[model samples]
Target: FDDAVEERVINEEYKIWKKNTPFLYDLVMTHALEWPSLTAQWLPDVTRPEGKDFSIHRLVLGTHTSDEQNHLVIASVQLPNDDAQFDASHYDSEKGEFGGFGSVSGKIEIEIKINHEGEVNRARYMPQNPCIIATKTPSSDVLVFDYTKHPSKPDPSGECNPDLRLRGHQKEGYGLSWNPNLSGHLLSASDDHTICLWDISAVPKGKVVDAKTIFTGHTAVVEDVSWHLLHESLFGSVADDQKLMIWDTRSNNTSKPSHSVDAHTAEVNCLSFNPYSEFILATGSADKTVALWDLRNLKLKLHSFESHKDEIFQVQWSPHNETILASSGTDRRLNVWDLSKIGEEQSPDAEDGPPELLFIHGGHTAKISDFSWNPNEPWVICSVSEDNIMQVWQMAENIYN
Candidate 1:
């Protein structure tokens, strides 16, 4: 189809979708970006200005631009009051458009922008100290920034120094995880087929830090890593080798994984541990499936979810619910699954694809690069697509309740 025709068709589909927003979502807001963001993460803070009807929530994102300078951005979004109106009749009769109702017509403001050295492959904030952020670039070094210490805008020359630099990886990497139980302790996975553990707890700011321990169990590129929710020394790593390896920092063999299992047929892209159930783990893979595993028994998977038509990019368990999980993929889909509903039978006339699947968010027309669940809210999620759009949405309570 011609570009104009394609654009019109997409716009028409969005109009139809928007018309049903009241029934499909409790709240939904979208923001277009100048450059596509490869990563999205919600900050751990929320506040309500005394007289305002909305709450202010902040999130971190990174820009990926070819000619323009890249940046690490701190943005704040307004979330409408829970009781806000959702009037479907608020339409523009002449323009044949929907005039969205209530305070749901929210806004996103760029509060801070730090000039970054390169496109951010992934970015995350430390759970204990949200002001401390980390980004993975095309180089072997991991850059750390203190949001409070950086200027709110990019420097005139489009150049600024990172607060600290993590040095050790032989090749560039995408996976980074800060230990939740241990402050300033981090794990970075690399294309060099290794993972490096860094302890910056005692290091002074604005200095280069070296890896405390180098792990070498993966035979291929380590795609992602996650620190165990409750264990300060235990962690997990997934790789292109299609294996999930569990590691312990205190193990005698620092280079070897404590337990290695063939987790999937294709490369495992990402993995997240259940915050409430320490032994329950979820992983998404290049084979286009999400699998849940019990760490107690690596011999078999507890369940598998096959929904996305393309490779999965990220999978995360909701911090509020142990049974709720979310996964995003190249299929332009961000799906939510509830493990408690796995064995329930769907009604004969039901159109929903699976019993475990609670909702399929199809707001983005391009591949969803990354998504993050709001740690402070139960079902709120912010997802960024490769097409330079970010969507913040909350499913209607009826759907999940």
Candidate 2:
């Protein structure tokens, strides 16, 4: 029994572990959707923000759900790592990778609750025109209401809440986003091929009669949209017509799209602008590869990488590192690519930026709807699929060694 051998990494020593023997246990920090569906859920990804019970701020994540009539609204708290203690004896060392770096361990994972409130809902904090979407449900227009004020709480209250009601959109609904810098500026994309800008803060007290800025350019159903960082007036939108349109919303005048790119052979699905640098935006397509564009000059961006197999559902920049990015596809896998290193020399290219592939989260064979990187924690990200599942990931940090 004393004849066992051992080895070390940095001139350190340990017992000689046989192949397949447990060595270092990796404590992976992850979260999962318990009750509600993923796309229909919004949660704060907590890393370290100064707060009450914990550091991560407990901001609300409002989701647009398809089931239970768009009226079902759910919100949650940012889970904290309490009650969880690491048991060293049970540490399965040889478990994950690189002995697990950056991944959370030892402490009880924070719990952001999944709630099933009333049925039918829409989520938008449009301080302009000051209306919250009163969706009959997330995916349908069975019922619509124009609301004034932000519903401070998401509960199973009733048909109407205190914050917002339902303001009639030009047509119907699809996607909505708030300006990165503006206080109450809101943007809405509809199936009718138009984008509406609402000045919510104009009547923050909850009134449906405020003025709304309109941007009509997508000749088809506008699927998803996002505002570019650094520039308050610059933003981008994508549509079912396979077009990507850029608009500048800084002025009060009726501003049309400033630049346009027609690159995808089919419909464009997702649009994301770099959070740190405004010139570059990322667009994913039904063709499977995610495209990066220089928003400063709206031309066909040649720098892109094959991020997914079917349709690229979402593309996001890291709040921490500009070079680190994440993309998810219908293929059911969320691929994290570091573009610092290949599109410069290769096609469908990206920097050999040290490719880090992550196993796809839940779906039950269904398609993925969306994914988001934690604005607070740089190493963490969450993905949601059509199957109603939300997956949280804490990337292993020390791979360079």
lDDT of 2 by residue, 166-237 (tens): 343555554667775786666667776777665555464424443366677778878777776667777789
In order, the Cα lDDT scores of the candidates are 0.87, 0.52
User: Candidate 1 residues 1-401, lDDT tens each?
Assistant: 68678567667767777777777787677789879999999998999888876678998999988865899999998876564544422121122235433322567899999998889889899888899999998878899999899889788797759999999998888899999999999999999999988988898887899998899999999999999989888999999999999998889896678888888899999999999998999989999999899889988989999788889989999989989999998878889999998878778624757888889887887889999998776799999999999998889989988
Q: List the residue pairs that clash in candidate 1.
A: none
Model 1 lDDT at residue 101: 36
Query: Model 1 lDDT vs. the true structure?
Result: 0.87
User: Which window of 10 residues has the lowest lDDT sum in candidate 1?
Assistant: 88-97
Candidate 2 wrong stretches, greater than 4 Å: 1-157, 166-171, 204-206, 250-256, 343-365
TM-score per candidate, in order? 0.92, 0.68
